[PDB]
Amino acid sequence: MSEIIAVANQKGGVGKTTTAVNLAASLAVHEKKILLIDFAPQANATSSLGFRRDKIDYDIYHVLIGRKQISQVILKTQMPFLDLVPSNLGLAGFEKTFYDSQDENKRGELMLKNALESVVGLYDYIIIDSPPALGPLTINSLSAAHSVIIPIQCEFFALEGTKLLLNTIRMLQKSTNPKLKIRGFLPTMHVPQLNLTKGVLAELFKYFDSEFFRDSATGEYIMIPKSVKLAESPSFGKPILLYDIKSNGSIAYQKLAQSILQG
Amino acid sequence: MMSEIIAVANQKGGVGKTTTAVNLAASLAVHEKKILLIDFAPQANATSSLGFRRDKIDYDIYHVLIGRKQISQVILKTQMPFLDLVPSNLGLAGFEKTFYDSQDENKRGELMLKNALESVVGLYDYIIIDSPPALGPLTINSLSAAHSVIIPIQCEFFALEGTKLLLNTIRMLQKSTNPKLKIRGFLPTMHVPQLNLTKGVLAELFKYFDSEFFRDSATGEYIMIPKSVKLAESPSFGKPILLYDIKSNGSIAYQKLAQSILQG
Ligand SMILES: Nc1ncnc2c1ncn2[C@@H]1O[C@H](COP(=O)(O)OP(=O)(O)OP(=O)(O)O)[C@@H](O)[C@H]1O
Ligand SMILES: Nc1ncnc2c1ncn2[C@@H]1O[C@H](COP(=O)(O)OP(=O)(O)OP(=O)(O)O)[C@@H](O)[C@H]1O
Ligand SMILES: [Mg+2]
Ligand SMILES: [Mg+2]
């Protein structure tokens, strides 16, 4: 039975896709069976794994509207234990479908959850990459999930942003997903010596210190460092472990996976 | 006054749309041009960048769009006399539902921002719109209202696939709802010239798009916003960078950007 993990932040460019891709790969290297769901219309996760937009046939949007079952759209990747549900531009049509269903039921929030029900016994982990909004796509991600990883870029808008995302999660924990947990807060693109980084982290630590990911071996906080090689990796269509497994970016995501595998 | 309405748009997240909208607006304001900044994103980062608390704001752009308030009822004065703000709130996430209601009955909704701006176009020299990271109803409304669009581009790998897709949306709107819409220009942001990935991405962008890039007409140079510690720090003080550090490289770059706009 899958643990379904959403990677969510409504702030743009905070490392959601990079985290979802590289965590899924770092778990798959252990020969745990992993499904990555690209839940964003811009489809950066799909492209990160080497799949160009013009080569995608049927995608997650076709599953949500019922043209395809989810087993029909699953792609195998270069890693034998990592599978991908690709996305495409057509997933921007989901918003229309969501509000239409809310005139035919109350159930639009559960459309991804219902789509995943035939694969939950086939994978150890299902990782969902969310778009930068609190709209219907992210609401579907969080309603399908057992847990949520929040990548945090520590710059100024993270302060107001983290508080809002947590309020969204609390409201879902009342209504549509009572079992939903914060898996953890993960600092991404992290540059420890910056004063802005220090100020933002200190503020988040006051309220949130128990939510930050820690190394299961050393007890240290797990943070993903700003890394030239991490930014280069989707241009090769590979997660960073498949080529440079000794870079600091690769080592950090591997620490994250080890922390997830403990439970 | 006849406003030039400029949208700042990219569906990629975190590429500097808000930083560009706020700092271009301030850089135009110091030339005694009357500027209206519209925060068109539900996350409301432009509102926070100018020193306002989102939770303290009663009525915003969402209420204007659905017709509950006139735009002149929600306009706030900022610290700079020539720069006014229409704030945003999380309630702007409700607009999508309103849009798809309007598309269902009369097939409208693209023009809701344009219609809302009609009473202020004679009152401002420039109206700058900060868009959210999506190609949805809010970005469709900002591009349908605009004379021109500035596309901030972070030059990392997803810029290549993403730029073409935004251009497609722009072309489709140029055929239907907004024929006058032009690209004002592509603006490289968070730019670190020495990186191999930066060089590779820019070479490919110049290959397809060279004529679209912002230029300093005095030197012929490409205008790029450098990665700057101070640019990231400035919204934490509720100031644009020219009020925070006017001599910093990011300040100098946004003033060059404003010169390019002002020269025509
Ligand atoms: N640790 C890191 N070091 C350096 N660059 C990074 C790191 N993490 C991500 N990046 C780069 O930063 C950019 C933004 O990251 P990414 O696209 O993963 O964020 P996102 O939150 O998924 O964005 P969006 O909101 O558009 O979905 C990408 O170009 C990526 O290659
Ligand atoms: N040239 C720069 N140098 C350093 N930091 C920058 C620069 N431009 C923007 N930033 C910082 O990078 C982050 C992303 O910028 P910003 O929020 O303006 O992007 P955006 O495209 O509006 O994001 P979103 O997609 O979330 O709306 C912000 O924290 C900002 O303070
Ligand atoms: Mg992403
Ligand atoms: Mg923004």
Residue numbers in the entry:
A (entry chain B): 2 to 264
B (entry chain A): 1 to 264
Sentences from the paper on this structure:
The ParABS system, composed of ParA (an ATPase), ParB (a DNA binding protein), and parS (a centromere-like DNA), regulates bacterial chromosome partition. The partition complex interacts with the nucleoid-bound ParA forming the nucleoprotein ParA–ParB–DNA complex, known as the nucleoid–adaptor complex (NAC).
To investigate the relationship between WNu and ATP hydrolysis, we solved the crystal structure of HpParAD41A in complex with ATP, HpParAD41A-ATP. We can clearly observe the WNu located and coordinated between the γ-phosphate and Asp41 in the wild type, while the WNu cannot be observed in the HpParAD41A-ATP. As a result, HpParAD41A exhibits reduced ATP hydrolysis activity and functions as a deficient mutant in ATP hydrolysis. We observed that HpParAD41A has a tendency to prolong the ATP-bound state when in dimer form.
